[model samples]
Target: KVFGRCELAAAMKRHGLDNYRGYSLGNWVCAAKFESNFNTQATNRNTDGSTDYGILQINSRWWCNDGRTPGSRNLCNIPCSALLSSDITASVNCAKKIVSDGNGMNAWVAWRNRCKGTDVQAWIRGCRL
Candidate 1:
């Protein structure tokens, strides 16, 4: 399912991403917009043959196990395909794990280039979160 902007915002908030690790809800909302446009089935292949999956595009190399990315590790202990589901709970939990590991939000280049150092409040302005 492709989530509406406010829908995604509320979902992310429900999953404890709001103000997580010093990053605001807008930061997550903005990054997710660029990462997958709120599409649950989004997938992206990186230059190193690693693939990203789900709304936040978690990497197969380090997060979920796709059994395709070379030397892949399943730090999240979940199947990569699970990230593609409409449920989004696994994806959001895995994302939280990634941030809790001290990697911060810079793990996604989209966040760095588009959401970082910006007033992302606009991303969730009307969400009323």
Candidate 2:
């Protein structure tokens, strides 16, 4: 894993992810915790034969290119494996790209189902950014 909750807050702040795309840092942190347990190497195979990659679980259908998917939009134009790195630069950039299109982190199922509308104080309590 690249970060713990506190560590992530600092990192996100450094990367200017605190409120990117109009979403709160707590929203991003909460979604990441649920989606991948904050593990950078995480990858989950979906029932649709597509895989979700990285901490944000970006879908191959619209974001990263795995090359197996025909007609993949690959808006980031980066390989899915690139997201599995511990660095998280590519993953974070791709996640921002995903929301830049107006998805508002709604594109991540984990966010919609888990992180959305939760009190943010707990999400960023001890984090010193």
Candidate 3:
């Protein structure tokens, strides 16, 4: 069931992440683990306990309104599928866009600074993306 390197690379390329390095896979994996444990069906509740759904922990009410529709609540909606199914590299690239201003390693650096004492940076270094 594992999507191999080439497949992941191709998917990343499709998402305009052709320049993503192998190390980025670790970053994506780490982000997924930290955010939602890679569970595609994961959901969160707001302060009012309203539902937010999918991997990357996208908020349904705010980020993706299409979640109200069947089969669309999952990765089929905006950004989730585009971020998840593409590949770890693509996923990280998308996350970088959300977190930074299109700076590659700089995004990694910022994430490292903010998420210190976590293994995110080590994971990024370990990934042979």
Candidate 4:
């Protein structure tokens, strides 16, 4: 399922992403937009045999266990396929773990390039949440 921007914003907020790790909801919304355009089933295979999965594009290397990524830590302790679900609970929870692991939102390059230090408010400007 592809989520609308506001819809995703509300969903993330419900999952406690707002103000998480000192980052606003807009940062997450913007990252999700640029990473997968809000598509829950999105996947990107890295040249180094790692794959990013789901709307937030969680990686196989240090997070989810895809069983193919070399030296996968699977810190999130979930199957990579679980991140692709439209429910987004697993994805959101794993994302929280990533941030709490001291990586912050910097784990995603898309967020770094597009959301960091920018006026991220526009990412959720039209949303009621």
What are the models' TM-scores?
0.96, 0.92, 0.44, 0.96
As a whole number from 0 to 100, the lDDT of residue 84 in candidate 4 is 98
Clashing residue pairs in all predictions, respectively, total 0, 0, 1, 0
lDDT of 1: 0.92
- Comparing 1 with 3 on lDDT, the higher-scoring candidate is 1
Give candidate 4 regions above 4 Å deviation. Answer: none
Q: State the lDDT of candidate 3 residue by residue for 1-129, as single tens digits.
A: 244334433443455543344334445445444555555455666665434443344444433443343333332235444433423543444444444434443433333444434554454343344
Instruction: Tell me the lDDT of candidate 4.
Output: 0.93
Residue lDDT tens for model 2, 2-115 = 578888766766777888978888888888899999888888988777788987888888888897877667888899999888777888888888878876888888888888
Model 1 lDDT per residue over 1-129, tens place: 999999999999998999989889999889889999999999999999999999999999999999989888999999999999998899989988987886699888899999999999899997767
lDDT of 4 by residue, 1-129 (tens): 999999999999999999999999999999999999999999999999999999999999999999998788898999999999989999999999987887689888999998899999998998998
Error of 1 at 84 (Å): 0.7
Q: CA shift at 33, candidate 2, in angstroms?
A: 0.6
* CA lDDT, every model vs. true structure: 0.92, 0.82, 0.44, 0.93
Ranking by lDDT: 4, 1, 2, 3
Query: Please, what's the RMSD in Å of model 3?
Result: 7.1
